[PDB]
Design a protein around this nucleic acid. Structure first.
Ligand SMILES: [K+]
Ligand SMILES: [K+]
Ligand SMILES: [K+]
Ligand SMILES: [Mg+2]
Ligand SMILES: [Mg+2]
Ligand SMILES: [Mg+2]
Ligand SMILES: [Mg+2]
Ligand SMILES: [Mg+2]
Ligand SMILES: [Mg+2]
Ligand SMILES: [Mg+2]
Ligand SMILES: [Mg+2]
Ligand SMILES: [Mg+2]
Ligand SMILES: [Mg+2]
Ligand SMILES: [Mg+2]
Ligand SMILES: [Mg+2]
Ligand SMILES: [Mg+2]
Ligand SMILES: [Mg+2]
Ligand SMILES: [Mg+2]
Ligand SMILES: [Mg+2]
Ligand SMILES: [Mg+2]
Ligand SMILES: [Mg+2]
Ligand SMILES: [Mg+2]
Ligand SMILES: [Mg+2]
Ligand SMILES: [Mg+2]
Ligand SMILES: [Mg+2]
Ligand SMILES: [Mg+2]
Ligand SMILES: [Mg+2]
Ligand SMILES: [Mg+2]
Ligand SMILES: [Mg+2]
Ligand SMILES: [Mg+2]
Ligand SMILES: [Mg+2]
Ligand SMILES: [Mg+2]
Ligand SMILES: [Mg+2]
Ligand SMILES: [Mg+2]
Ligand SMILES: [Mg+2]
Ligand SMILES: [Mg+2]
Ligand SMILES: [Mg+2]
Ligand SMILES: [Mg+2]
Ligand SMILES: [Mg+2]
Ligand SMILES: [Mg+2]
Ligand SMILES: [Mg+2]
Ligand SMILES: [Mg+2]
Ligand SMILES: [Mg+2]
Ligand SMILES: [Mg+2]
Ligand SMILES: [Mg+2]
Ligand code: NA
Ligand code: NA
Ligand code: NA
Ligand code: NA
Ligand code: NA
Ligand code: NA
Ligand code: NA
Lengths: 47, 255, 111, 72, 81, 50
RNA sequence: CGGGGAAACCCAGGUGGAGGCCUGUAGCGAUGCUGACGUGCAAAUCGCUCGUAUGAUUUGGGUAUCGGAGCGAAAGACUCA
RNA sequence: GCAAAGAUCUAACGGAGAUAUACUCAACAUGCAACGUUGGAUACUGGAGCGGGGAAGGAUUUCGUGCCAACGGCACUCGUACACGAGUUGUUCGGAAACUGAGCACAACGUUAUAUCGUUUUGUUAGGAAAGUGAAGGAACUGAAAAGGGGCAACAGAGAACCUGGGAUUAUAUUCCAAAAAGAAAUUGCAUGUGGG
RNA sequence: CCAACUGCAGACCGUACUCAUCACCGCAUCAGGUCCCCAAGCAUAGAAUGCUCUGGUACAUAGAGAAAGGUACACUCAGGGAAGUCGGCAAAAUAGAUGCGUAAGUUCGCAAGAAGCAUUGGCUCUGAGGGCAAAAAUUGCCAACUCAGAACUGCUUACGGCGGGGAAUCCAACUGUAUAAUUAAAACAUAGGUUUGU
RNA sequence: GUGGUAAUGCGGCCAGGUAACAAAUCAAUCCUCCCACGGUGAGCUUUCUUUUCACCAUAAUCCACCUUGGGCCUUUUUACUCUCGCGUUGUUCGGAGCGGGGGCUCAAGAUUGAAAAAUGCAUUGUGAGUUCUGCGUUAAAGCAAAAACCUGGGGU
RNA sequence: AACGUGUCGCGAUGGAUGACUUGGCUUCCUAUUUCGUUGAAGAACGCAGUAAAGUGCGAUAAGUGGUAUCAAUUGCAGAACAUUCAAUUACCGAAUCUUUGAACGCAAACGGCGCAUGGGAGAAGCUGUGUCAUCCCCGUGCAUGCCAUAUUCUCAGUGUCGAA
């Protein structure tokens, strides 16, 4: 997941927390490094 | 009818040995070359109790004959075996308590235990606490030794069979009254599931030949044939005689 | 308003390996903390008496691995395995028994 | 946490590249110089106000001094 | 007392889900399935219950490969020129 | 309780995902015969026992 | 440890905490009311009363032995009402 | 008949759930009975708890908003109901990677018309040749000695490097917190320097 | 060479909630059943029992309300005191602690709490039972409760909780076990004794 | 490699050790309760009440190093000469080395400081409980094992 | 008188009857008609703009390719080669085909763990670039038995011979 974050959004994932939801999907909490802003990345993502 | 209890035990099932805390089989050394031509010198390292056995056990340390290594033997300890004692086993070992010698090298009238019925048996005769054999005579032609077993029978074995000098430790155990059902419970805890005992006449006729009646009674003679099938062979099995033994107690067993 | 505590690690049985101590935190809370198991410490051989050895610590697994070597032995021969008295016994025995053997061999040769 | 008891050892610690920052605590009686290295927080405690004042200056610029206070 | 109270006494489970057939017939202690006899290589099949056989036989699933090869047989394994 | 094998958790997840009512536009369709899910499950009525 | 005693031994007072020992919780049972209820709270429960409560004790989990069979301190008891 | 487990009262607010009217009639004698919340009062549980956490079992019942057709054997504005939308974050906690136990039984062999049978830990499979690589020596190719094949079985035994603070949630937290990491540690695996005697 | 740093990297699954007078089993939100941890104050021997701070709760269909007749983890009753009844069934009774005292029988352990007699409140005091320090057989300071004994003064005998006792006969030695759901016994077991096979 | 008379201090293979084990007694660590004193807030206040209630906290991980108990060394060892001595609540112990003096060591705790006030909420002494730990009787009952890890004996 | 009876008209409750049948049952026939280690049957989990079940399909997932056919599908939405590039249908040669299962690297209430071999990604250092330890991801092979075989592979036997 860290590698794919780098490859898809050109951003550094400093920490990935994961869980499998009770509906069966895996959710990832991804903290970016302080060199990157989560809001700007979310905007480029369209979030 | 249903399966008699004495026939149910043959299945194994819940009636097997309670061996979990047992230290292992107690044996003499392997009858190897060093014991056939010379002697091996050992040191008693510990005297230990094991669940289900009256006699004490000895851990005896020998050197390996062919490798740089130590070999630990587990033996039934004769009375008097102490920690730090040297134990000599073999053809040329001296005559002393705890030493293991071939029966042909042991003087007549000597008291021995842990006796090999066959050479290399590692001990099968006179092992219960307090028990021993007496060497009656040697036949240097046939190479056989005649001995008196604890049961009172006299048996001959090859003079190459090994024996330990002395009597098995722990003697006198059956002299103390048990006094309590709980003490019997703890005694059989380390052996097997065979207690308490329910009399056959207290059972119902479905599960035992002695069962049933409007009084508790065996309605037929309790002496049964040697040829009785399992399930019928209960009671006094192929008894030569019954009743209170008067005068000399005859040696039991076969002729 | 006296407090009552809860198991905080997922094991909720009071075994010798799950002993707990009551701890008051700087936030003024009473919590449970796991008490480490202790090792009985380095001993002489059980067949020789099973006595604690002087100069050796009672270190359990990880602390034994990461501790310095002299924490677990002494500079005398057999240090960490045998006491001083057992060492003296073995030294005197080795010397005396070899002396007896050479004396008897000299006797056999002279005969 | 590790305590450093000599100014020379304190300066050796502060000279490390591992020294991320220097936090300075003014206690009513003493002053505490805490250096945040990679593994350990190293503390020198000084009882002179003037010695502490001289230390709060002349520290390298590459690492930063932090005046620790109560925060919101 | 047998009955209601002893219904309260029943803890655990004799069976869990079987990896092979999915029927909740896998005996936990014996480690074998009461419905399909897993892990024995062949399945359970008894003629005294034709109904169970008709429940489990070929055609009660989706026959995902069987349909394709049946079509290929019906078309005589036709191939492009 | 806390413990479950992931496979059991996935089966329970699929059962949760299935415990939904019928969309109404399904009832508006031309040959429609469905109006209620009829396989709805309440945790108190019937057990899955995974 | 104190007193007697020729000796063997005897008479006290303290210590110590043994026991399938007693009273009594929890626990494990179930004697009587032939009580309640008896289309019940319940296809065996409720109340009071009662047995035992360091042991042949009680209990979780795991594991082993079954239908012409298993298991049974034996009641033809128990083997998912 | 809906009677064990003592119990509710009062005001205000909310609510369609009211102070609901033909003539006469001031209000009683013509809209009763019941609700949820907050405050106050009264009581009970009484730490072997209608307390706070776990296993088994259950599997969304958790949380927020909304809604009262059916269900909650009376009632409801309320709900473990129903609808919509959410929620479970770990180098260190539990498991597994990775222990042995009572035991199990793949292989092997034997038996059986039939393997869907038996043996298989009393150091230990099998008439039984079940070891495949430390080294070297001129980068992966070759090979000594080492007796008894491969697994499984403990979420309370063995084992296991983290713990306080938070103004940090609607619901998770020894799991989240961001350079003053609130912060303080411990511990693996590789690499880089300093120094060594 | 490798022992202190330092640099980077620390994968997988579980994690909501519940664990029960409504979340499990008993067709059900059923007075039945279901393992573990933490466990406060006063009375008191106390995890008995009663009440209480913290936490929790007012959820169990309710209102009105002296018929008979019921059920009760509710009482009382003149005189008599088992005459009732198959049978003292049920109920009543005894009661804590302390001192004194205690028969037959006996495997010498017991029987035994045998049986019985007496006393315990409240106040105000007195005595005894210690630790630390600098004929120390004394000099200071100090803490925890108990036991005993007086004077005075009360009783309407007054919370809870808490054995009735004795003389004999039958049976089984004893503690245990046992017909889940009509039988707990004298039945089974038991230690002890004897026999049999080897 | 190295120091101390010593107890012991410091920088392939083989054999032991930890893991590793029933009970009671008596002391007990944290922790809980109580009491004393002193702060902070609240409550009662017709009348009393120097009062009643609440709170006064310090995690892991490190550094340094004032008792209890166990094992041991060295030294005095006419120590036990006809009532030997030491010690437990308790069943003991001693020329196979008691007791005294001086040391070595282990286990529990103390004390100092770093963490740490920058956090938390609106304080420093005693008495009772409490099994972490220390102290290394029933038995014809004597109360698991292995991985992993530790140390030595030999050899490089 | 009030309950209560009778009869008739009209209502309710309740779903019989009749007509309707894309179903069942039974009989007959035609064939280049009979699955799977090239991994079946069966289990499991997913896939639509909207999608619980069912159907269909498999990360190419209510479907890709092809040949015909010719203007839809349709609850809404969305799309808009027509001389055939259609979310049309029909058929079929090309493809795809998750976790399993005889299931076969070892296990399994574990989306677990290996050996060999090919790859991928890759921080810090090195000249943005390449390179890359540990860690991580993917492909392939690896059960047991049996048969054949080795351009003639490597061995064992106090089995039988035999060197020169
Ligand atoms: K059910
Ligand atoms: K009344
Ligand atoms: K009354
Ligand atoms: Mg996680
Ligand atoms: Mg056996
Ligand atoms: Mg009978
Ligand atoms: Mg018969
Ligand atoms: Mg008879
Ligand atoms: Mg009789
Ligand atoms: Mg008779
Ligand atoms: Mg489940
Ligand atoms: Mg008793
Ligand atoms: Mg009755
Ligand atoms: Mg009968
Ligand atoms: Mg009525
Ligand atoms: Mg109350
Ligand atoms: Mg509770
Ligand atoms: Mg209702
Ligand atoms: Mg719902
Ligand atoms: Mg085994
Ligand atoms: Mg395992
Ligand atoms: Mg863990
Ligand atoms: Mg939770
Ligand atoms: Mg609970
Ligand atoms: Mg109490
Ligand atoms: Mg109580
Ligand atoms: Mg209720
Ligand atoms: Mg009710
Ligand atoms: Mg009267
Ligand atoms: Mg009267
Ligand atoms: Mg009469
Ligand atoms: Mg009469
Ligand atoms: Mg009575
Ligand atoms: Mg008498
Ligand atoms: Mg009497
Ligand atoms: Mg009396
Ligand atoms: Mg009896
Ligand atoms: Mg009897
Ligand atoms: Mg008798
Ligand atoms: Mg008893
Ligand atoms: Mg009895
Ligand atoms: Mg009965
Ligand atoms: Mg009997
Ligand atoms: Mg669907
Ligand atoms: Mg297989
Ligand atoms: Na007969
Ligand atoms: Na078959
Ligand atoms: Na649970
Ligand atoms: Na009493
Ligand atoms: Na009523
Ligand atoms: Na949802
Ligand atoms: Na209930």
């Amino acid at each position: 997941i860290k590698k794919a974050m780098r490859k898809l959004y050109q951003v550094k994932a400093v920490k990935v927390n994961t869980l499998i939801r009770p509906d069966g999907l895996k959710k990832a909490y991804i903290r970016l490094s302080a060199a990157h802003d989560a809001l700007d990345t979310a905007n480029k993502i369209g979030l | 009818g249903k399966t008699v209890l004495s026939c149910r035990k043959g299945n194994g099932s819940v009636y097997q040995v309670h061996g979990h805390k047992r230290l292992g089989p107690a044996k003499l050394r392997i009858l190897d070359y060093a014991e056939r031509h010379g002697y091996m010198r050992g040191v008693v390292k510990s005297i230990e109790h094991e669940a289900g056995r009256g006699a004490a056990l000895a851990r005896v340390e020998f050197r390996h004959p062919y490798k740089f290594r130590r070999v630990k033997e587990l033996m039934v300890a004769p009375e008097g075996m102490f920690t730090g004692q040297s134990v000599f086993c073999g053809q040329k070992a001296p005559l002393a308590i705890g030493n293991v010698l071939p029966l042909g090298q042991i003087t007549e009238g000597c008291i021995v235990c842990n006796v090999e019925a066959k050479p290399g048996d590692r001990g099968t005769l006179a092992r219960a606490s307090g028990d021993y054999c007496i060497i009656i005579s040697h036949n240097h032609e046939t190479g056989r030794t005649r001995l008196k077993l604890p049961s009172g029978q006299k048996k001959s074995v090859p003079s190459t069979s090994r024996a330990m000098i002395g009597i098995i430790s722990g003697g006198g155990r059956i002299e103390k009254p048990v006094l309590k059902a709980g003490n019997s419970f703890y005694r059989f805890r380390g052996k097997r599931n065979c207690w308490p005992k329910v009399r056959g006449v207290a059972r119902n006729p479905v599960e035992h030949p002695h069962g049933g009646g409007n009084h508790q009674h065996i309605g037929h003679p309790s002496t049964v044939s040697r040829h009785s099938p399992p399930g019928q062979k209960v009671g006094l099995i192929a008894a030569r005689r019954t009743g209170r033994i008067r005068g000399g107690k005859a040696v039991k067993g076969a002729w | 308003s006296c407090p009552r505590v809860q198991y905080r690690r997922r094991m909720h049985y009071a075994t010798r390996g799950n002993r707990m101590k009551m701890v008051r935190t700087p936030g003024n809370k009473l919590v449970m903390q796991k008490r480490a198991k202790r090792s009985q410490g380095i001993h002489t051989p059980w067949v020789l008496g099973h006595k604690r050895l002087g100069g050796t610590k009672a270190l359990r697994h990880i602390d034994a691995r990461l501790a310095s070597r002299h924490e677990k032995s002494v500079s005398r021969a057999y240090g960490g395995v045998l006491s001083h008295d057992q060492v003296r016994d073995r030294v005197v025995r080795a010397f005396l028994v070899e002396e007896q053997r050479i004396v008897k061999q000299a006797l056999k040769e002279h005969s | 946490p590790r305590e450093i008891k000599t100014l020379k050892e304190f300066l050796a610690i502060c000279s490390r590249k591992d020294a991320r920052c220097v936090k300075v605590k003014h206690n009513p009686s003493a002053t505490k110089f805490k250096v945040r290295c990679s593994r350990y927080l190293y503390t020198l405690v000084v009882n002179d106000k003037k010695k502490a004042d001289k230390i709060e200056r002349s520290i390298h610029p590459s690492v930063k001094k932090i005046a620790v206070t109560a925060r919101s | 007392t047998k009955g209601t109270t002893s219904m309260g006494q029943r803890h655990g489970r004799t069976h869990i889900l079987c990896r092979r057939c999915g029927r909740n017939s896998y005996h936990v202690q014996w480690e074998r399935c009461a419905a399909c006899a897993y892990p024995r290589a062949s399945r359970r099949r008894y003629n005294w219950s034709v109904k169970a056989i008709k429940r489990r036989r070929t055609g009660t699933g989706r026959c995902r490969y069987l349909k394709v090869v049946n079509r290929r047989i019906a078309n005589h394994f036709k191939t492009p020129k | 309780g806390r413990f479950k094998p992931l496979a059991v958790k996935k089966k329970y997840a699929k059962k949760m995902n299935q415990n939904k009512p019928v969309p109404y536009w399904i009832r508006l369709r031309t040959g429609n015969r469905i109006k209620w899910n009829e396989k709805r499950r309440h945790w108190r009525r019937t057990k899955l026992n995974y």
